[PDB]
Design an enzyme around this catalytic site. Structure first.
Site, PDB file in Angstrom:
ATOM      1  N   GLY A 146      45.607  16.260 -17.952  1.00  0.00           N
ATOM      2  CA  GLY A 146      46.529  15.894 -19.018  1.00  0.00           C
ATOM      3  C   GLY A 146      46.704  14.397 -19.255  1.00  0.00           C
ATOM      4  N   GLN A 147      47.524  13.974 -20.218  1.00  0.00           N
ATOM      5  CA  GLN A 147      47.758  12.578 -20.536  1.00  0.00           C
ATOM      6  C   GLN A 147      48.177  11.705 -19.356  1.00  0.00           C
ATOM      7  OE1 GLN A 147      50.240  10.807 -23.853  1.00  0.00           O
ATOM      8  NE2 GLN A 147      49.238   8.951 -23.529  1.00  0.00           N
ATOM      9  N   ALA A 148      49.092  12.128 -18.478  1.00  0.00           N
ATOM     10  CA  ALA A 148      49.458  11.338 -17.306  1.00  0.00           C
ATOM     11  C   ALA A 148      48.341  11.231 -16.280  1.00  0.00           C
ATOM     12  CB  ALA A 148      50.701  11.887 -16.629  1.00  0.00           C
ATOM     13  N   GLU A 189      43.727  15.759   7.819  1.00  0.00           N
ATOM     14  CA  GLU A 189      44.750  15.514   8.820  1.00  0.00           C
ATOM     15  C   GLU A 189      46.154  15.386   8.271  1.00  0.00           C
ATOM     16  OE1 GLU A 189      41.224  12.679  10.557  1.00  0.00           O
ATOM     17  OE2 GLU A 189      43.052  12.132  11.526  1.00  0.00           O
ATOM     18  N   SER A 193      51.277  15.424 -14.138  1.00  0.00           N
ATOM     19  CA  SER A 193      52.723  15.529 -14.137  1.00  0.00           C
ATOM     20  C   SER A 193      53.211  16.960 -14.149  1.00  0.00           C
ATOM     21  CB  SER A 193      53.307  14.799 -15.335  1.00  0.00           C
ATOM     22  OG  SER A 193      54.695  15.044 -15.412  1.00  0.00           O
ATOM     23  N   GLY A 199      54.265  17.660 -17.537  1.00  0.00           N
ATOM     24  CA  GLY A 199      53.257  17.631 -18.587  1.00  0.00           C
ATOM     25  C   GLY A 199      52.989  18.989 -19.218  1.00  0.00           C
ATOM     26  N   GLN A 230      45.849   8.738 -17.737  1.00  0.00           N
ATOM     27  CA  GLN A 230      46.367   7.384 -17.807  1.00  0.00           C
ATOM     28  C   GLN A 230      46.387   6.741 -16.428  1.00  0.00           C
ATOM     29  OE1 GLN A 230      48.478   6.296 -21.859  1.00  0.00           O
ATOM     30  NE2 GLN A 230      49.775   7.595 -20.670  1.00  0.00           N
ATOM     31  N   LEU A 267      41.136  13.606   4.916  1.00  0.00           N
ATOM     32  CA  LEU A 267      41.936  14.334   3.957  1.00  0.00           C
ATOM     33  C   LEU A 267      42.448  15.621   4.606  1.00  0.00           C
ATOM     34  CD1 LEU A 267      42.681  14.487   1.063  1.00  0.00           C
ATOM     35  CD2 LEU A 267      40.239  14.441   0.460  1.00  0.00           C
ATOM     36  N   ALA A 325      48.196  20.511 -25.805  1.00  0.00           N
ATOM     37  CA  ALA A 325      49.054  21.582 -25.337  1.00  0.00           C
ATOM     38  C   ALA A 325      50.534  21.499 -25.675  1.00  0.00           C
ATOM     39  CB  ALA A 325      48.919  21.708 -23.825  1.00  0.00           C
TER      40      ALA A 325
HETATM   41  N1  LIG Z   1      53.543   7.878 -14.377  1.00  0.00           N
HETATM   42  C1  LIG Z   1      53.231   8.205 -15.644  1.00  0.00           C
HETATM   43  N2  LIG Z   1      53.754   9.342 -16.127  1.00  0.00           N
HETATM   44  C2  LIG Z   1      53.293   9.547 -17.381  1.00  0.00           C
HETATM   45  C3  LIG Z   1      52.323   8.850 -18.058  1.00  0.00           C
HETATM   46  N3  LIG Z   1      52.086   9.407 -19.316  1.00  0.00           N
HETATM   47  C4  LIG Z   1      53.067  10.258 -19.426  1.00  0.00           C
HETATM   48  N4  LIG Z   1      53.767  10.471 -18.269  1.00  0.00           N
HETATM   49  C5  LIG Z   1      54.511  11.669 -17.813  1.00  0.00           C
HETATM   50  O1  LIG Z   1      53.791  12.877 -17.863  1.00  0.00           O
HETATM   51  C6  LIG Z   1      54.428  13.776 -18.739  1.00  0.00           C
HETATM   52  C7  LIG Z   1      53.864  13.723 -20.157  1.00  0.00           C
HETATM   53  O2  LIG Z   1      52.588  14.221 -20.448  1.00  0.00           O
HETATM   54  P1  LIG Z   1      52.229  15.238 -21.651  1.00  0.00           P
HETATM   55  O3  LIG Z   1      52.580  14.448 -22.845  1.00  0.00           O
HETATM   56  O4  LIG Z   1      52.984  16.492 -21.416  1.00  0.00           O
HETATM   57  O5  LIG Z   1      50.618  15.318 -21.589  1.00  0.00           O
HETATM   58  P2  LIG Z   1      49.768  16.665 -21.383  1.00  0.00           P
HETATM   59  O6  LIG Z   1      49.931  17.071 -19.974  1.00  0.00           O
HETATM   60  O7  LIG Z   1      48.367  16.385 -21.760  1.00  0.00           O
HETATM   61  O8  LIG Z   1      50.465  17.726 -22.386  1.00  0.00           O
HETATM   62  P3  LIG Z   1      49.754  17.814 -23.833  1.00  0.00           P
HETATM   63  O9  LIG Z   1      49.274  16.455 -24.188  1.00  0.00           O
HETATM   64  O10 LIG Z   1      50.763  18.464 -24.689  1.00  0.00           O
HETATM   65  O11 LIG Z   1      48.488  18.472 -23.464  1.00  0.00           O
HETATM   66  C8  LIG Z   1      55.920  13.481 -18.747  1.00  0.00           C
HETATM   67  O12 LIG Z   1      56.472  14.258 -17.711  1.00  0.00           O
HETATM   68  C9  LIG Z   1      55.840  11.975 -18.494  1.00  0.00           C
HETATM   69  O13 LIG Z   1      56.973  11.452 -17.839  1.00  0.00           O
HETATM   70  C10 LIG Z   1      51.629   7.798 -17.417  1.00  0.00           C
HETATM   71  O14 LIG Z   1      50.595   7.236 -17.757  1.00  0.00           O
HETATM   72  N5  LIG Z   1      52.234   7.447 -16.218  1.00  0.00           N
HETATM   73  N1  LIG Z   2      43.058   4.278  23.592  1.00  0.00           N
HETATM   74  C1  LIG Z   2      42.366   4.610  22.492  1.00  0.00           C
HETATM   75  N2  LIG Z   2      42.817   5.624  21.750  1.00  0.00           N
HETATM   76  C2  LIG Z   2      42.298   5.685  20.509  1.00  0.00           C
HETATM   77  C3  LIG Z   2      41.373   4.821  19.967  1.00  0.00           C
HETATM   78  N3  LIG Z   2      41.139   5.245  18.667  1.00  0.00           N
HETATM   79  C4  LIG Z   2      41.777   6.372  18.507  1.00  0.00           C
HETATM   80  N4  LIG Z   2      42.580   6.651  19.572  1.00  0.00           N
HETATM   81  C5  LIG Z   2      43.626   7.686  19.755  1.00  0.00           C
HETATM   82  O1  LIG Z   2      43.095   8.996  19.672  1.00  0.00           O
HETATM   83  C6  LIG Z   2      43.840   9.813  18.808  1.00  0.00           C
HETATM   84  C7  LIG Z   2      43.007   9.986  17.542  1.00  0.00           C
HETATM   85  O2  LIG Z   2      42.320  11.217  17.482  1.00  0.00           O
HETATM   86  P1  LIG Z   2      40.860  11.357  16.842  1.00  0.00           P
HETATM   87  O3  LIG Z   2      39.877  10.786  17.805  1.00  0.00           O
HETATM   88  O4  LIG Z   2      40.989  10.708  15.515  1.00  0.00           O
HETATM   89  O5  LIG Z   2      40.581  12.938  16.736  1.00  0.00           O
HETATM   90  P2  LIG Z   2      39.134  13.625  16.860  1.00  0.00           P
HETATM   91  O6  LIG Z   2      38.163  12.764  16.150  1.00  0.00           O
HETATM   92  O7  LIG Z   2      39.319  14.891  16.118  1.00  0.00           O
HETATM   93  O8  LIG Z   2      38.770  13.913  18.260  1.00  0.00           O
HETATM   94  C8  LIG Z   2      45.172   9.080  18.680  1.00  0.00           C
HETATM   95  O9  LIG Z   2      45.912   9.420  19.826  1.00  0.00           O
HETATM   96  C9  LIG Z   2      44.815   7.605  18.807  1.00  0.00           C
HETATM   97  O10 LIG Z   2      45.770   6.672  19.276  1.00  0.00           O
HETATM   98  C10 LIG Z   2      40.810   3.847  20.827  1.00  0.00           C
HETATM   99  O11 LIG Z   2      39.834   3.123  20.625  1.00  0.00           O
HETATM  100  N5  LIG Z   2      41.360   3.738  22.093  1.00  0.00           N
HETATM  101 MG   LIG Z   3      47.607  16.777 -23.561  1.00  0.00          MG
END
Ligand SMILES: Nc1nc2c(ncn2[C@@H]2O[C@H](COP(=O)(O)OP(=O)(O)OP(=O)(O)O)[C@@H](O)[C@H]2O)c(=O)[nH]1
Ligand SMILES: Nc1nc2c(ncn2[C@@H]2O[C@H](COP(=O)(O)OP(=O)(O)O)[C@@H](O)[C@H]2O)c(=O)[nH]1
Ligand SMILES: [Mg+2]
Lengths: 451, 445
Positions: free
Chosen positions: A10-12, A254, A140, A143, A15, A252, A99
């Site tokens: 969407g627009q947000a 953890e 949003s 949105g 943007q 992503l 929309a």
């Molecule tokens: N942070 C931020 N919020 C935004 C921005 N643009 C709009 N908004 C927010 O997002 C929502 C507006 O988006 P909409 O106009 O509904 O856009 P859309 O999702 O595409 O809906 P349609 O355009 O009708 O398809 C509102 O809740 C706004 O507060 C932006 O660039 N920054």
């Molecule tokens: N002492 C020590 N601990 C570390 C270091 N880097 C990461 N850790 C520790 O190990 C943990 C991180 O886990 P991680 O190794 O990322 O998980 P894994 O990769 O899934 O085995 C945390 O407790 C950190 O503080 C390091 O070089 N030395």
């Molecule tokens: Mg839109």
């Protein structure tokens, strides 16, 4: 390897994606037409950022991005803007009618006419991820497409790719500021549909970021280009561990394993710091303690509820640039020791800490603070239950009178859909109340002595 | 003849591992080509304990690298001594463990661990007499915890009489780096307790305090903190590689450190430790080494040994040492500190002395102390674990990989049993225990 794929819904979302994808080029040296201007290994090497780009040709970068609103007006701005020659032309996707700020147009009519073209281009990006992590959606809740398409995308992804990380990044309802008369409905038909899907969802509010810009950055005039060009640094601070090396990096996955005690309680509220004016940055000391203090300050929060109205469950507090593990341990031990900064009774372990060596880097085109180090924080807390209570207030005055509901009816939606989304809000209200309680044990009824 | 394999696992355990292997390469005079150009016969003539020999005057370290996330593994490759590491000893996933011990045990580790076991085997048919296994990892990690306890519990079925030894990052008392620490640690300790031979507990809250107090380091980095660890693993293996007056190899060590098969968790220490100011003034002597070895803030665990009693102690002294001066300092401690030893193990000391000091120290000593005091670790973690599983908190992520609630109960049941065994022997009498009943007097009829 470690690939992520963003969808700008969407627009947000769009943007925001224009702000984000200035900075994702700019961090690596990658130019506004995808070019690497100097490459120490043409056809391999470092290039640690194939996680954010697929390479073509003689070392031209294509990003791993998608753009969609059913408005040409906001996508053509990508295809005619400053970065037109970066992105892929079948990744600037439109529809035939926007929309109207409405759900049902997304989920049952016109989003439902474009979802299979979008899911197909997503399938071609996904097959070219050798180590697909998962996907992020930027939206949003208020949105129209924001509500109506995210919902229909995550009804598709979560059974197309399943165990793959399902993320959202959401503009979250302002307390007193509003944009549209129809935001409470858009928010609540999406939580009903999509909270069953995201493993973690990351939250910000414009009313707080306007505050940050007016206070902290000391800007008189926040444009949305001023606002969104802050948010860039939030996902730049989340995504660093996948883009650069360090000492204690965070995938992503953890955030999910650590931010989420329960799989409805996965909406942590962001903040990022330091944030200063170009006057303040020359008188501040900006050590790791003083950042971490400003990171828990209530005014400084990127969703505008005071965390003190809540209690903290969990938290994730990643550090970037000039940062030291003992110095960080020291700031954690300090906020911990101030028990007045309030956790739940039951909390054994509430924290998730990280170290990435690459610093914070800003944009061209401001009076901006080129700091040496930063933090990016996400708070999980019952304080979100204050802004659920506001959605509980907004909804019931409109929905009883049945204001607006005929606009959702006439574009494919059940009445029971609104009802059953607010039913879920009636649950969520309590899903958040059965946590904020102290771990003490007992049941039933008594009136007499044991002793 | 006798040679050791090391494994490094987790983003934590490989970052320690990569720098252990630098410190060791220094001790042996290995150049970052993997070539010996050192400075003593012995360094080359006992290179075998640690490296494979290769043609054209090359050594390859007999260490394996394991993480389900590719990130840090490549950081090790383009860094210091990264090119001496064998490409076919890097074994890496794509997804990560996600901090999740059960994603490591059941999903992404089962999917990868045979391919490792095969390299571990190819290393084991390189060892003329396979000593056993060293590990560096993290208990608060995902992969180090979950895919390491997968590997630990699978080795033991394949390598029954060899030793399997561990240097674990362990959760600390004041702060925490990962939220699932008590789950990961407690799920870990469940496997470790019955498939290992030594458990060296290493704690960043102590490592950070030793760097700040004793070395006057205003800003301790992980660079700093791994160094101490490396110089202690160094210490603990000094008696295979380097000679002296008393050699105490990893077998002999373990025999004197484990009194019953589950009481195998230790507080190591390094001596000396002195700021750039301090080095000028403190004399580097056997009595100042011994005093720093027992110094209750200088141990590598954030837990105070004076809260309990030593079952047993060991020391590895390195350099020109004088046997009466060692033994009498070991005696002076046990005399002035009688309250800190358990009374039914007599004379609680294992001595041992090497001729050869660590590179860049004129003399050093290593502490490996086994105290009741470690009750503290398992006391804190098992309450934090009941704090979690009592409320099924964080648990959907692990069940969500095919684990069951019975297993959380059995990891807990055992840690509580284990803390009850260390507390049974916390201050256990040299006076007889129980059954105090008797035969009477003869009675008129
Ligand atoms: N942070 C931020 N919020 C935004 C921005 N643009 C709009 N908004 C927010 O997002 C929502 C507006 O988006 P909409 O106009 O509904 O856009 P859309 O999702 O595409 O809906 P349609 O355009 O009708 O398809 C509102 O809740 C706004 O507060 C932006 O660039 N920054
Ligand atoms: N002492 C020590 N601990 C570390 C270091 N880097 C990461 N850790 C520790 O190990 C943990 C991180 O886990 P991680 O190794 O990322 O998980 P894994 O990769 O899934 O085995 C945390 O407790 C950190 O503080 C390091 O070089 N030395
Ligand atoms: Mg839109």
């Amino acid at each position: 390897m470690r690939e992520c794929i963003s969808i700008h819904v969407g627009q947000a979302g769009v943007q925001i994606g224009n702000a984000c994808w200035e900075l994702y080029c700019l961090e690596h040296g990658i130019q506004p037409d995808g070019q690497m201007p100097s490459d120490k290994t043409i056809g391999g090497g470092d290039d640690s950022f194939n996680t954010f780009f697929s390479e073509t040709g003689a070392g031209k970068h294509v990003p791993r991005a998608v753009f969609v609103d059913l408005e040409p007006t906001v996508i053509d701005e990508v295809r005619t803007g400053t970065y037109r020659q970066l992105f892929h032309p079948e990744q600037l996707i439109t529809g035939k009618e926007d929309a109207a700020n409405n759900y049902a147009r997304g989920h049952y009519t016109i989003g439902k006419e474009i979802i299979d073209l979008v899911l197909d281009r997503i399938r071609k990006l996904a097959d070219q991820c050798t180590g697909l992590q998962g996907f992020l959606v930027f939206h949003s809740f208020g949105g129209g497409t924001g509500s109506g398409f995210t919902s229909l995308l995550m009804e598709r992804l979560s059974v197309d790719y399943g165990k793959k990380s399902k993320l959202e990044f959401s503009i979250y309802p302002a307390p007193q500021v509003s944009t549209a008369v129809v935001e409470p409905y858009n928010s609540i038909l999406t939580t009903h549909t999509t909270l069953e899907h995201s493993d973690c969802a990351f939250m910000v509010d414009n009313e707080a970021i306007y505050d940050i810009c007016r206070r902290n950055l000391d800007i008189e005039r926040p444009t949305y280009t001023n606002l969104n060009r802050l948010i860039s640094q939030i996902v730049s601070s989340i995504t660093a561990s996948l883009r650069f090396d360090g000492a204690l990096n965070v995938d992503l996955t953890e955030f999910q394993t650590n931010l989420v005690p329960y799989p409805r309680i996965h909406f942590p509220l962001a903040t990022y710091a330091p944030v200063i004016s170009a006057e303040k940055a020359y008188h501040e000391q900006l050590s790791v303690a003083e950042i971490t203090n400003a990171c828990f300050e209530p005014a400084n929060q990127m969703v505008k509820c005071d965390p003190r109205h809540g209690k903290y469950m969990a938290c994730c507090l990643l550090y970037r640039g000039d940062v030291v593990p003992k110095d960080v341990n020291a700031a954690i031990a300090t906020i911990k020791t101030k028990r007045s900064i309030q956790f739940v009774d039951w909390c054994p372990t509430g924290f998730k800490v990280g170290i990435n060596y690459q610093p914070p880097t800003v944009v061209p085109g401001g009076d901006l603070a080129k700091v040496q180090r930063a933090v990016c924080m996400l708070s999980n807390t019952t304080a979100i239950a204050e802004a659920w209570a506001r959605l509980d207030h907004k909804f019931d005055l409109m929905y009883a009178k049945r204001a607006f509901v005929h606009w959702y009816v006439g574009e494919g939606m059940e009445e029971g859909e609104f009802s059953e989304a607010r039913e879920d809000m009636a649950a969520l209200e309590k899903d958040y109340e059965e946590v904020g309680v102290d771990s003490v044990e007992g049941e039933g009824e008594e009136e007499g002595e044991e002793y | 003849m006798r040679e050791i394999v090391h494994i490094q696992a987790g983003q934590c355990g490989n970052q320690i591992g990569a720098k252990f292997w630098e410190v060791i390469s220094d001790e042996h005079g290995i150049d970052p080509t993997g070539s010996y150009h050192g400075d003593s016969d012995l360094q080359l003539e006992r290179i075998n304990v640690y490296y494979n020999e290769a043609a054209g005057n090359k050594y390859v370290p007999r260490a394996i690298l394991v993480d389900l996330e590719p990130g840090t593994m490549d950081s090790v490759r383009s860094g210091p001594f990264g090119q001496i590491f064998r490409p076919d000893n890097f074994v890496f996933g794509q997804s990560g463990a996600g901090n999740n011990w059960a994603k490591g045990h059941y999903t992404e580790g089962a999917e990868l661990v045979d391919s490792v076991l095969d390299v571990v085997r190819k290393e084991s048919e390189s060892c003329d007499c396979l000593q056993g296994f060293q590990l560096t990892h993290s208990l608060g990690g995902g992969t180090g915890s979950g895919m390491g306890t997968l590997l630990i519990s699978k080795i033991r079925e394949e390598y029954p009489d060899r030793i399997m030894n561990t240097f674990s990052v362990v959760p600390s008392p004041k702060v925490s780096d990962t939220v699932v620490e008590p789950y990961n640690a407690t799920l870990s300790v469940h496997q470790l307790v019955e498939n290992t031979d030594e458990t060296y507990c290493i704690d960043n809250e102590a490592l950070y305090d030793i760097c700040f107090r004793t070395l006057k380091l205003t800003t301790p980095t992980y660079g700093d903190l791994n160094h101490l660890v490396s110089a202690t693993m160094s210490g603990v293996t000094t008696c295979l590689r380097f000679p002296g007056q008393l050699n105490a190899d990893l077998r002999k060590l373990a025999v004197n450190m484990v009194p019953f098969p589950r009481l195998h968790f230790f507080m190591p220490g390094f001596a000396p430790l002195t700021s750039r100011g301090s080095q000028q003034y403190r004399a580097l002597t056997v009595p100042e080494l011994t005093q720093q070895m027992f110094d209750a803030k200088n141990m590598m665990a954030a837990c105070d040994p004076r809260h309990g009693r030593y079952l047993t102690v060991a020391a590895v002294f390195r350099g020109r040492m004088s046997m009466k001066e060692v033994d009498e300092q070991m005696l002076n401690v046990q005399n002035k500190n009688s309250s800190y030893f358990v009374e039914w193990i007599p004379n609680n000391v294992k001595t041992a002395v090497c001729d050869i000091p660590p590179r860049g120290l004129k003399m050093s000593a290593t502490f490996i102390g086994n105290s009741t005091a470690i009750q503290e670790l398992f006391k804190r973690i098992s309450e934090q674990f009941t704090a979690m599983f009592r409320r099924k908190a964080f648990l959907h992520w692990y069940t969500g990989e095919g684990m069951d609630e019975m297993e959380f109960t059995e990891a807990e049941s055992n840690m509580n049993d284990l803390v009850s065994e260390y507390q049974q022997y916390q201050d256990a009498t040299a006076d007889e225990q129980g059954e105090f009943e008797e035969e009477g007097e003869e009675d008129e009829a």
